[PDB]
Amino acid sequence: AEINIFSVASGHLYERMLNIMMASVMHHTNHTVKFWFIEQFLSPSFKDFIPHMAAEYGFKYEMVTYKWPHWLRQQKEKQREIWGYKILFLDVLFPLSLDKVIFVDADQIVRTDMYDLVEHPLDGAPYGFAPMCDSRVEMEGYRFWKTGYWANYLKGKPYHISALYVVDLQRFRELAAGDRLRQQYHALSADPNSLANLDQDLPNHMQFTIPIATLPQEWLWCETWCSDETLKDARTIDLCNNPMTKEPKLDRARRQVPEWTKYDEEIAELARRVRE
Ligand SMILES: O=c1ccn([C@@H]2O[C@H](COP(=O)(O)OP(=O)(O)O[C@H]3O[C@H](CO)[C@@H](O)[C@H](O)[C@H]3O)[C@@H](O)[C@H]2O)c(=O)[nH]1
Ligand SMILES: *[C@@H]1O[C@H](CO)[C@@H](O)[C@H](O)[C@H]1NC(C)=O
Numbered sequence: 001a002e003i004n005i006f007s008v009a010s011g012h013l014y015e016r017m018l019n020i021m022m023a024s025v026m027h028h029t030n031h032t033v034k035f036w037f038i039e040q041f042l043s044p045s046f047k048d049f050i051p052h053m054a055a056e057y058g059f060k061y062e063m064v065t066y067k068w069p070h071w072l073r074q075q076k077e078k079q080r081e082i083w084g085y086k087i088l089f090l091d092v093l094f095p096l097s098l099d100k101v102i103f104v105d106a107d108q109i110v111r112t113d114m115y116d117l118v119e120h121p122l123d124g125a126p127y128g129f130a131p132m133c134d135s136r137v138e139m140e141g142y143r144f145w146k147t148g149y150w151a152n153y154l155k156g157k158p159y160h161i162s163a164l165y166v167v168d169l170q171r172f173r174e175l176a177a178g179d180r181l182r183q184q185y186h187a188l189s190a191d192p193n194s195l196a197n198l199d200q201d202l203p204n205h206m207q208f209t210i211p212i213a214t215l216p217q218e219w220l221w222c223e224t225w226c227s228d229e230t231l232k233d234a235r236t237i238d239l240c241n242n243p244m245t246k247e248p249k250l251d252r253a254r255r256q257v258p259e260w261t262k263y264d265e266e267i268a269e270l271a272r273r274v275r276e
């Protein structure tokens with residue numbers, strides 16, 4: 001397909017949002033789309049419904065089942081294992097014939113033609129991530145990356161959010177990025193205090209040697225970090241956790257994104273159509 005997106009979802013709530021993410025992508029593009037799923041975390045009901053979504057929204061899809069290598073340090077916490085699947089196996093999850101894939105979070109709402117990210121220049125980087133917003137000034141106390149360890153490590157480089165990222169698989173394979181990320185993760189994870197945010201900390205840690213193309217800030221907006229004024233420019237939205245309010249996930253979705261209920265109700269209408 002012209003646009004290839006992968007995502008990971010574990011739980012009924014994240015599968016419900018994953019269907020919404022997919023409908024939002026297809027409402028904003030006429031280019032061909034293929035969705036790739038990390039199979040082992042999904043429910044039987046989701047896997048049964050995905051051909052119905054595919055036929056209604058007009059996309060292709062594929063399930064990838066990749067076993068965690070025995071040598072590689074395992075993660076006992078399911079959340080951390082799922083983070084490992086986002087970042088450690090980018091060279092082995094997809095076929096050698098696929099040249100590019102984008103990770104889009106299951107809780108995202110897309111408001112752009114995702115082919116614009118496929119066409120974005122990476123200047124030789126094997127992947128691109130958006131930076132964490134600095135625009136919501138009242139949240140500065142929670143930007144852990146602006147002081148301590150990260151401020152000294154980064155030397156003014158951005159601390160990137162891992163909700164969305166484009167992977168040029170040809171370049172990623174040319175650089176042996178997959179083998180190098182697995183080895184650094186294995187060494188660093190011997191310390192259980194390292195890589196607190198595994199999927200996010202690992203590429204940010206490796207960005208002096210596995211380059212990151214810093215994407216336009218508009219590629220990823222999250223209310224927690226980003227101003228209300230920049231929402232209108234946002235290409236995609238992440239429903240990231242707000243450590244100050246601790247607002248529930250579905251409340252954030254309905255309150256922030258006016259079209260969320262429309263996609264949710266449309267997918268539920270498709271489900272009642274297939275059921276009868
Ligand atoms: O498929 C999923 C994803 C998350 N959770 C749980 O939901 C809670 C909160 O996680 P989540 O909704 O993923 O937090 P976000 O704030 O959305 O996550 C942000 O920060 C994470 C790194 O900390 C990145 O992986 C995400 O892409 C980014 O959106 C945790 O208990 C997770 O285990 C699930 O049950 N299933
Ligand atoms: C898809 O094609 C139709 C053709 O009339 C056009 O109106 C619509 O804007 C196109 N959408 C995108 C995202 O290109």
Ligand SMILES: [Ca+2]
Pocket residue numbers: 105106107108163238239240
């Ligand atoms: Ca998220």
